[PDB]
Amino acid sequence: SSFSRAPQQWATFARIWYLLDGKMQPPGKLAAMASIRLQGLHKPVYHALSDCGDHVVIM
Amino acid sequence: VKKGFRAAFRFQKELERQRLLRCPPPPVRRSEKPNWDYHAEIQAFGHRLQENFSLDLLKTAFVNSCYIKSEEAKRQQLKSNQELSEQGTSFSQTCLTQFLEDEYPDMPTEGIKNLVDFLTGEEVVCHVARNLAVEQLTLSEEFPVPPAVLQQTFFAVIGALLQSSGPERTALFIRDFLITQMTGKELFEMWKIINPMGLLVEELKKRNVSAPESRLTRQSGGTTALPLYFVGLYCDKKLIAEGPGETVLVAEEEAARVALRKLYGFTENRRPWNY
Amino acid sequence: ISRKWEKKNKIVYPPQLPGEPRRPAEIYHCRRQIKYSKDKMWYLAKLIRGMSIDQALAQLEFNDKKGAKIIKEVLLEAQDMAVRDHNVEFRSNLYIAESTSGRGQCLKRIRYHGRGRFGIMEKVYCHYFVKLVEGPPPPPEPPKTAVAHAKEYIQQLRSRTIVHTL
Amino acid sequence: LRNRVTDRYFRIQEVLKHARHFRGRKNRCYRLAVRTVIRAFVKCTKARYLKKKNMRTLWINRITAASQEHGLKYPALIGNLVKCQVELNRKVLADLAIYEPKTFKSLAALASRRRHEGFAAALGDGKEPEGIFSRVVQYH
Amino acid sequence: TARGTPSRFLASVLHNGLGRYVQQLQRLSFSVSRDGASSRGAREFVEREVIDFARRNPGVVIYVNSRPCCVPRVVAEYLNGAVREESIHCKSVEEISTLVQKLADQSGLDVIRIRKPFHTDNPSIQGQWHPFTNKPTTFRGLRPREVQ
Amino acid sequence: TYSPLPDDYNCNVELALTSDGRTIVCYHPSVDIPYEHTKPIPHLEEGPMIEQLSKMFFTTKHRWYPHGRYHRCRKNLNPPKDR
Amino acid sequence: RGRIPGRQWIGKHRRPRFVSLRAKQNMIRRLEIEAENHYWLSMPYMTREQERGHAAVRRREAFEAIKAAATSKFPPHRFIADQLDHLNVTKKWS
Ligand SMILES: [Mg+2]
Ligand SMILES: [Mg+2]
Ligand SMILES: [Mg+2]
């Protein structure tokens, strides 16, 4: 690691902006992958108390 | 009134307990408080931390010059600890520098000594000594004792320990206790620095390599109020360090800090101190 | 009953040194067994708390209420009290800090309802307490700006950490 | 009166002492706290099994997440682990993914290789050289 | 109760594990009496085991008041100064021996709920996880749907 | 040449067994970010303020309102720090 | 909409529960191992008149041990030691 405390904690719980193209896709499957990415379940450090969610953009 | 006094007794214990919490008295020395024997305590204390030597050297270390002023003052109305503290802190500085430079030859004499000055500082030494009951044995004029006076008494114990046991046992003492407090805090927590990338380019010229360039590798939330950049420092198209940060400047200086740790060998994933 | 509020004036702090912060002299005063409901003048106590006395004299004496006449006569009699025998330089450069009210020794009577039933009527007496402190009054804490909102939230995101883990 | 309890004051205070943090008239009065203090204690007991189930299922979501990042799913993952004889519970398996994803990548790479070995075994059960990692240790 | 009681992260007093171990019990102050039937356990404990307890632990210091007391007490303070008193009223010698032994074993920090059952000073090796650990980069460093 | 996962984003991974076949070893040095995969470096009131910072932080307006003194006093002032 | 008469699990009309392949796979596993059982407890080792009087010794001596355990029922033994140790509550120093 060799990272400082506050910068390392910031990068871990930071948010990220996903992008998705909805051309010829069903609203459910894009919703299924999106919803898990909204709580931050994809993050191995997930916890419901910590709002570690990430943004999602659909087109 | 209903009969009985047992309930009224324990209630007075509850009243004085609340009166204690409401208006507590100021603290005092443990010698003032009951159940105290002076000679037996330093003896029992010496056996606690596994040290055995003459009481003349012990009492001379715990005694300060300030208490002698009040002692003779109250007498009208013996030996200080300056020499012991002098030799104590002298050997500690040389010994701490010895083990640190042997483990980290890459660290310069400037930064390695500032760390030794920190571990031998007031807040660190007094915290170790406060949690080793040196405050109860030390005697001064004012209570709570100052940190500088308590610091002098601590090294005075190191001096008396040096004269009796030897350097090897004194080395084992200061090595074990102080370094364990160093395990927690990383370099730039106690040893703060200015212009890290400037110091980085200075160090890299000593190591005979080119001037690196800062380049953002990854980005997120740039226009957002939570910017995030992964800045990496490359020289000759080869990377050394990568550092996150809020802005490009915070990520740049952080990446400069990341290189300084591994350059001096103070990485978080380095070999812990053997015993 | 209890009358500690009068004993609060009897304390005596030790002498202060030359090179130390000038202490603001406090002083207490109250009135006992007034004919006015506890919750009523508590509104008046909520008004005056956090302003200056002479500015407070203006508000209540224009306030069309009975309690104001009762809690103004306690104010300026605490004003001239504080200067005559408590060493207050300015009768105006001071600020009230604690103004509250409380129940008193009430009195119960009977009100005659219809069909023979009776209703217990409680007459209300109260005790009004006021504390004065010299020096100018403190300014009101303004509403927290967007910078305070932002920094508090970033501090929350910086202070949080992983849980149920190594 | 000849016999009267004198320490009624204390046996209720210990109840209210635990119930100070309650809201409303519960922390002040006694009987309101008696209804809630035992109920709060009862919920504390069986909440352990909820703590077990919640934290257990939480580790499943974590390991399921790190596996999907590397291109696998949790049910196939642990199947390869126990097949390859590594008894790492869900705590360390999750916690390993937190601090060393390089290690968890090796666990996933170890797991994915066992799947191809298992599918190769699905084609031919015997009559072939067994998988190198699918080989087992025999204790006796 | 966890929420009503305070809590803490697990930690030791000045890292007593690596270096030389030190018995973190500083002092024991027994309060017994020449009378009172409840003091039979403490006095017989003073006769037999308190002697051997001192021989076993030269570091710890012991004091005995031996004053009139309706209830015997035993007070124990540690290096940090955390005082902890327990009642030995009407207790057997065997229970008191185990009680004084565990007092010698434990450290000077208040027994409360622990936030977690361990503590790691350097938990991170190979770099702690951030979102960009397990995904690749882009040629020329380009975001999705970007020309230049 | 066959690989179980693409070794181009996290680390170059390769597994290995001792010849007896009782222990498994791994070698995973981290990837080096190429130079090509980089870039060069270069008042108001309650209503308007609570919504604009909500649009700025991408969150709701509820948490920004002030809480009561009941919760402000229950907040711990000396929380424990780990590591 | 979609209610049902009375209780959900009794009466002339209740909620019609249906089967899943999970429960099917579960119960066939229980009776197929029972078919493995049905094979094993067949082909006995000994005959009826072979195993007639082989264990009567153990069942007799075992029951006699229960008889001795039942007869062995009395109050415990009293002593002057445990009686006079109560006197030691007033042991006090000189
Ligand atoms: Mg009524
Ligand atoms: Mg389970
Ligand atoms: Mg129904």
Between CA E80 and CA G67 the distance in angstroms is 64
Contacts for B131 with CB less than 8 Å, ≥ 6 apart: E13, E14, E79, E80
Nearest bound ligand to CA D50? 2
Contact B48 E59 (CB under 8 A): yes
Nearest bound ligand to CA C121? 1
Nearest chain D residue to C164 by CA: give it: D55
Between CA D136 and CA D17 the distance in angstroms is 59
Amino acid at D23: R
Between β-strands B228-235 and B238-245, what pairing exists: parallel, antiparallel or unpaired? antiparallel
- 3-state percent helix, strand, coil for chain E, nearest multiple of 5: 20, 20, 60
- The H-or-E segment that residue D14 falls in is helix D8-18
Helix and strand numbers (H, E) in chain B are 13, 3
Q: Does C159 contact chain D (CB < 8 Å)?
A: no
Query: Coil, strand, or helix at residue F33?
Result: coil
Question: Domain of E115?
Answer: 1-148
Q: What's the angle, vertex CA B117, arms to CA B114 and CA B119, rounded to 5?
A: 110
Between CA G94 and CA G73 the distance in angstroms is 46
Contact D61 A46 (CB under 8 A): yes
Dihedral (CA of D42, D43, D47, D49) sign:
positive
Between CA B164 and CA G74 the distance in angstroms is 71
Provide, as residue numbers in chain A, all residues whose Cβ is less than 8 Å from the Cβ of B217. Answer: none
Q: What's the angle, vertex CA B69, arms to CA B63 and CA B73, rounded to 5?
A: 130
Provide, as residue numbers in chain C, all residues whose Cβ is less than 8 Å from the Cβ of F82. Answer: 161
- Residue A22 · residue A58 · CB < 8 Å: yes
**Region of B237 on the Ramachandran plot (φ > 0 left; ψ -120 to 50 alpha; else beta):** left
Contact A1 B257 (CB under 8 A): no
DSSP bridge pairs for A55: A17
> Chains with ≥3 Cβ pairs under 8 A against F?
B, C, D, E
- What ranges in D19-137 are assigned the alpha helix state H? 31-70, 74-83, 90-99, 101-123
Q: B254: burial class by Cβ within 10 Å (0-12, 13-18, 19+)?
A: buried
- Residue B180 · residue B274 · CB < 8 Å: no
Between CA G86 and CA D105 the distance in angstroms is 71
CATH number for E117: 3.40.30.10
Which tokens sit at D29? 């009065």
Looking at chain G, after which residues does the C atom sit over 2.5 Å from the next written N, breaking the chain?
A: none
| Among F23, E126, F28, E125, CA closest to D109 | F28
DSSP bridge pairs for B228: B220
Cα–Cα distances (Å) from G72 to B88, G69, G75, G76, in that order, read: 77, 5, 10, 11
> Secondary structure of chain G in the HEC alphabet?
CCCCCCCCCCCCCCCCCCCCHHHHHHHHHHHHHHHHHHHHCCCCCCCCCCCCCCCHHHHHHHHHHHHHHHHCCCCCCCCHHHHHHHHHHHCCCC
- Residue E97 · residue E88 · CB < 8 Å: no
Q: Does A9 contact chain C (CB < 8 Å)?
A: yes
Contacts for E78 with CB less than 8 Å, ≥ 6 apart: E13, E24, E25, E26, E84, E107, E108, E109
Provide, as residue numbers in chain A, all residues whose Cβ is less than 8 Å from the Cβ of E144. Answer: 19
- The H-or-E segment that residue C38 falls in is helix C38-48
Q: Supply φ then ψ for residue B268, to 5 degrees.
A: -65, -25
Q: B90: burial class by Cβ within 10 Å (0-12, 13-18, 19+)?
A: middle
Size of interface A-C (CB pairs under 8 A): 18
Nearest bound ligand to CA C119? 1
- The number of distinct structural domains making up chain E is 1
Between CA C24 and CA B96 the distance in angstroms is 52
Contacts for B48 with CB less than 8 Å, ≥ 6 apart: E22, E23, E26, E59, E60
Distance D57 CA to ligand 2 centre (A): 9
Between CA C62 and CA C49 the distance in angstroms is 17
- Residue E46 · residue E64 · CB < 8 Å: yes
Chain D: nearest CA to B185, how far in angstroms? 19
Q: What's the angle, vertex CA B257, arms to CA B256 and CA B262, rounded to 5?
A: 100
Contact E124 B244 (CB under 8 A): no
DSSP for B68-79, written as a single string: HHHHHHHHH---
- The number of distinct structural domains making up chain D is 1
Query: Coil, strand, or helix at residue B208?
Result: coil
Angle subtended by helix axes C53-62 and C38-48, to nearest 10:
140
Between CA D35 and CA D26 the distance in angstroms is 9
| Among B168, B159, B17, CA closest to B88 | B159
Q: Does B7 contact chain F (CB < 8 Å)?
A: no
Between CA C28 and CA C82 the distance in angstroms is 9
Nearest chain D residue to F4 by CA: give it: D109
Which tokens sit at D83? 């097949």
**N-terminal to C-terminal alpha carbon distance within chain C:** 59
- Residue B267 · residue B261 · CB < 8 Å: yes
Between CA F46 and CA D33 the distance in angstroms is 40
Between CA E39 and CA E68 the distance in angstroms is 10
Dihedral (CA of C15, C19, C21, C24) sign:
positive
A1-13 CB burial, b ≥16 within 10 A, e <16: bbbbeebbbbbbb
Amino acid at A38: L
All domains of chain C, ordered by start, with CATH? 1-166 (3.90.470.10)
> Secondary structure of C52-103 in the HEC alphabet?
EHHHHHHHHHHCCCCHHHHHHHHHHHHHHHHHHCCCCCCCCCEEEEEEEEEE
Between CA E89 and CA E69 the distance in angstroms is 11
- Residue E83 · residue E75 · CB < 8 Å: yes
- Residue D106 · residue D86 · CB < 8 Å: no
| Among E64, E97, E65, E99, CA closest to E84 | E99
**Region of E126 on the Ramachandran plot (φ > 0 left; ψ -120 to 50 alpha; else beta):** left
Between β-strands E61-64 and E25-31, what pairing exists: parallel, antiparallel or unpaired? parallel
Nearest chain D residue to E131 by CA: give it: D69
Provide, as residue numbers in chain D, all residues whose Cβ is less than 8 Å from the Cβ of F17. Answer: 132-133
Distance D78 CA to ligand 2 centre (A): 15
Q: Supply φ then ψ for residue D72, to 5 degrees.
A: -135, 175
Between CA B62 and CA B155 the distance in angstroms is 10
Best residue of G86, G90, G91, G93 to probe chain E, by most E CBs closer than 10 Å: G93
- Residue C126 · residue C102 · CB < 8 Å: yes
